[PDB]
Every structure is written in C-alpha cells, then in structure tokens.
Symmetry: D2
Amino acid sequence: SPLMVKVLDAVRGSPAINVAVHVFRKAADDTWEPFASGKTSESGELHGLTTEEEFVEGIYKVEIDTKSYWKALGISPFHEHAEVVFTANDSGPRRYTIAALLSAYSYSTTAVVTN
Amino acid sequence: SPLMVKVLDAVRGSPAINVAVHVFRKAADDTWEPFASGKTSESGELHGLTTEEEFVEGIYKVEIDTKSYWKALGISPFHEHAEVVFTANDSGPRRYTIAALLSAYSYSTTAVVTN
Amino acid sequence: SPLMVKVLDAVRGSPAINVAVHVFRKAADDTWEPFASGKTSESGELHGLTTEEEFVEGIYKVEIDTKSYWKALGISPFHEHAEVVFTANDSGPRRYTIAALLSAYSYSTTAVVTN
Amino acid sequence: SPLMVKVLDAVRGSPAINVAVHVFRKAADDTWEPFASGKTSESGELHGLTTEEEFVEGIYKVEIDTKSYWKALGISPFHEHAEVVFTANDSGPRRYTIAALLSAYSYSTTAVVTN
Ligand SMILES: [Cl-]
Ligand SMILES: [Cl-]
Ligand SMILES: [Cl-]
Ligand SMILES: [Cl-]
C-alpha cells in the first residue's frame, strides 16, 4: 500500500489497537468520496489500505475515529476524531505513512514520506 | 470568549502569527455552518472569537489554515490544514482553549478546558 | 524574566498546576549548577524565574518534574521527568519560552523564542 | 532487544536516519553509566541495542543526539539533544519502544510498552 496509517496511545503507552480509520478522496467537485478504510492491527498499524493502481493524485482526508477507541477503553475523550488532510502528488513520494499519537485531550500526527 | 485558539510554530520557534482560523458548528442536520473566524495576533493567540451568548452546545470544528501560513513564510507544507473537532457540553467546562503546534509535516493539538 | 516555562496536561486537558521546574546552567567545567527554580501557577505558567542580569550565555537544562505532578493526581507515569536542554546566545532571541505538554507515557516540548 | 528506539523527522517528513542514540543506566550510586548505544537505520529505527540478559531493572536515560542530526542536514537547531528518562520494572512490560519526533525547536517522545 502506498498509504499506511499507524496509531499510538499516549495515555496507556501502547499501540492503538482496533482503531477505525477512513480515507476519503476529494472528488472534483467538491465532496469527500469514501476511498479506503480499515482497522489497525495489534501493532497499531493499518496495512493494505489501498494499491498504487487506486491511489491517484488528489486531496485525501484520513479520519481516525479516536472517540470510539477511547470509549471502548473506558474513556470519554475530548475529540470527536483525528483528521489528517493532504495532497498526493505523483512528483511527490511513492509512500505516505500517517502516524498519530492519541491522548484524551490531545493528538499529534506526522507524515512520513518515503521511497 | 468561551473559545480561544493559540498556535505555535515548531519550525521557526515562534508564535504562529496571522494564521486564519475558522470555527464551524454542526447544524442539525447535518452540515458545517460558519460560526466564527479570525486571525491570530502577534502572540499567536486568537481572542474574541465568540461570546457565551452565541456559543451553545453542539459539535464544533476548528479549522486552522496551516497551508497559507507556511506558504507566506516560504514553505510548501504537507497538510492542507489542521482540524480539531469536539463537542461542547454545558455541563462541561466554561472555557475551551485549542492549542496547536505546527511543523511542515506534522501538527499536534491539545484542548485546555478551564473555569 | 528572559526565561519562562509553561506546562499543559493532555490527559486531563488542563494547565499543569504546581509542577516543580528546575533550571541548571552548565558551569565550565563541566557540571550542572542550580540556576533557578519554581512551581507553575494556576495557569500552568512559571513567571519570574530569572532576570536579564543573571541569565547569561551558556548551556541550560530545564527539568520539569513530571513524576510528582502525576502522582499527586493519582497517576504513576512512565517518565521520571521531562528535560529540555539548549544554548542561550546573546545574538539569539531576548526571550525564551519552554512549553511542555505532558501525558502519562509521552511528552512534547517546544521553544518559543521572541523579542 | 527489550529496548528499541525509533526517531522521525517532522521538518522533512522522513525517518530520522543515522541519529546517534545513547542509553545510560543510573548506577547506584549515583551517576549515569554508559549502557548501550547505536545509530538509527534507514527506517529511523535502532535495533539490537541490548539483550534481556543485560537489561536489568533500574533508571535509564535515553539521549538522542538531535543536534548533530540537524547540522548534518544543514540546520542549526534549538535543542542540544532529546532526553528520555524512565524506570524499568521487571513487573513492568517486557519490551519498551522509545519513539521520538524531532523538529528544529521542538520534540516529542512517547513510550510504547508491550509484551
Ligand atoms: Cl458521546
Ligand atoms: Cl498548492
Ligand atoms: Cl516510584
Ligand atoms: Cl554549536
């Protein structure tokens, strides 16, 4: 997959397991099409999201459903979810990894772009 | 204002000055109404966004327009913007501060809820 | 004070109140002298740490005692403390703000350097 | 290795490659013994740091030498280094992963503790 997502838990110090993740592509015009989705594994990683064939240039939104993750662990968190929005360019990097770190009232995300 | 937003710059180590910020409220149903907006000051803070009269319970989205901030500083960043989405509850805290820390390929946000 | 420290709590979504903070200066040579210290206020901020007279060039260590903060709130955290180490240059910025965001298993810090 | 360290770069959006990492153990008493060290690989990961035989209970310091990393990439950063200090307990988790995310004026670290 040219797009991978990895999620960590900063409250419990663990991979974020079984987190739902949705990818949308901005169709032109001008709304968010469901593009790909899945749930993180025991390592907190979500593999096989998409393929080079399906992953074309465009604006993508990665929605990590942090709210249900926390409730399943006994926590009612601040955020509804975590969102990451970016443009995929073919001149850009071949592989994108979206990494997220979750707390009850905070989150950080970073993009790791490689070849 | 019961809602304040503060933005820092982790690449240059400065307040994020003149960043555009938009707040939307999820109207029922089921879209994002423009609710309030403004630009951060020299301290990277955005004051007077709204009032207790206008700020009712609901789901709010705070969109920080990180892309134009970075381009104005000579940087073409990864993210289109930074988004923070949360529910305001009247049983909840009287004041919400959304703090964001921006990098070219990363951002973190935290909510500071006080009385 | 040319040095200020501000600490936030990402688990509870609050300023980090009454956190002990120690500043050391690397004496030449080659150990850490106690330079200044204090406890954050209700806003999570530590003001009046030092003065322009006392704050000379050198290597400084800011130790935030995150462990006792968390235990006082009923949490046994991962880290012993949070440390930030940097060089103050007179050609550099007049004011340094060290901002920290604490979780049970994580912390981030950023330096905000201004005039 | 029961201890692994992974480092990401938030300015360039890449694994942090060839970063020097030092682990010290607080000998009793009361100083920091060199315990283990190495340099991150192309994935930004540092494997084979130590073994279950050598990794006993105690207080450990992980020093990531962020300054030379940045200079090698043409950047003069704020921090001298990134430090992470924690207690290893045998009742604790079998494996510790220290993850760090670096910017010029900021860093975050998180501990991922697993079995
Ligand atoms: Cl709910
Ligand atoms: Cl563009
Ligand atoms: Cl203890
Ligand atoms: Cl130097």
